[PDB]
From a paper:
Human CEACAM1 (hCEACAM1) is a single pass type I transmembrane protein expressed as 12 alternatively spliced isoforms that all contain an N-terminal V set fold of the immunoglobulin superfamily (IgV) ectodomain followed by up to three type 2 constant immunoglobulin (IgC2) ectodomains (A1, B, A2), a transmembrane sequence, and a signaling cytoplasmic domain. CEACAM1 function is triggered by intercellular or trans binding of the IgV domain, resulting in higher order surface CEACAM1 oligomerization and subsequent intracellular signal transduction. In contrast to other immunoreceptors such as the T cell inhibitory and mucin domain-containing protein 3 (TIM-3), programmed cell death protein 1 (PD-1), and programmed death-ligand 1 (PD-L1), CEACAM1 serves as its own primary ligand, owing to high affinity homophilic interactions of its unique IgV domain, as well as an important microbial receptor. The displaced CC′ loop forms a cleft with the FG loop that exposes the key residues F29, S32, Y34, V39, G41, Q44, Q89, I91, N97, and E99 critical in mediating homophilic CEACAM1 interactions.
Another defining feature of the GFCC′ interface in the hCEACAM1 WT homodimer is the important contribution of N97 in mediating a critical hydrogen bond network comprising seven hydrogen bond interactions. In the N97A mutant crystal, we observed two monomeric N97A molecules [(a), (b)] in the asymmetric unit devoid of any GFCC′-mediated interactions despite high concentration (>800 μM) and global similarity in secondary structure of both N97A molecules (a) and (b) compared to hCEACAM1 WT (RMSD of 0.4 Å over 638 atoms and 0.6 Å over 628 atoms, respectively). In fact, only two residues participated in hydrogen bond interactions less than 3.5 Å apart between two molecules of N97A in the static crystal structure: Q26 of molecule (a) and I67 of molecule (b). Thus, the hCEACAM1 IgV N97A crystal structure highlighted the critical properties of an asymmetric hydrogen bond network crucial towards mediating hCEACAM1 IgV dimerization. The downfield G41 peak (indicator of an intermolecular hydrogen bond in the WT homodimer) was absent in the 15N-HSQC spectrum of N97A mutant, confirming a global conformation transition from a dimer to monomer state. The residues that shifted the most followed a distribution pattern similar to the chemical shift differences observed between WT and N97A mutant proteins at the GFCC′ face, consistent with the notion that the N97A protein resides in a rapid monomer–dimer dynamic equilibrium in the fast-to-intermediate exchange regime on the NMR timescale. Fitting the peak trajectories of residues Q44 and A49 provided a rough estimate of over 1 mM affinity (dissociation constant KD) for the hCEACAM1 N97A homodimer, consistent with the previous studies. While the crystal structure of the N97A mutant showed the lowest B factor value of 16 Å2, a closer examination revealed higher B factor profiles of the CC′, EF, and FG loop residues.
Numbering used by the authors: 1 to 107
């Protein structure tokens, strides 16, 4: 199963967290990250197109995140308010979506 996991789960204020992503399918066309536990357009952080390697910031983009070619999401300068769930959507070459949710806590 597609999974995402924070490294570290417990994150000091002002430091960084990497959302690692595991069990990707091959032949992917894009990624989309969201704040919260589901796919919710109003809370899209970033979208990525594999074909062109272009990142497009969404309405939940903070300016403090980077999505990598392997789907992982690095968040820097973390704030208390960053504590939450983060949902990844992967779009395969047949346009079928897979999703995973992960989370971290800022202290």
């Amino acid at each position: 199963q597609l999974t995402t996991e924070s490294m570290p789960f417990n994150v000091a204020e002002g430091k960084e967290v990497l959302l690692l992503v595991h069990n990707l399918p091959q032949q992917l066309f894009g990624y989309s990250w969201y704040k919260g536990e589901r796919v919710d357009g109003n809370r899209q952080i970033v979208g990525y197109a594999i074909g062109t390697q272009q990142a497009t910031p969404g309405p939940a983009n903070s300016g403090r995140e980077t999505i990598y070619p392997n789907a992982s999401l690095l968040i820097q300068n973390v704030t208390q308010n960053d504590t939450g769930f983060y949902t990844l959507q992967v779009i395969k070459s047949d346009l079928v979506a897979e999703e995973a949710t992960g989370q971290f806590h800022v202290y």
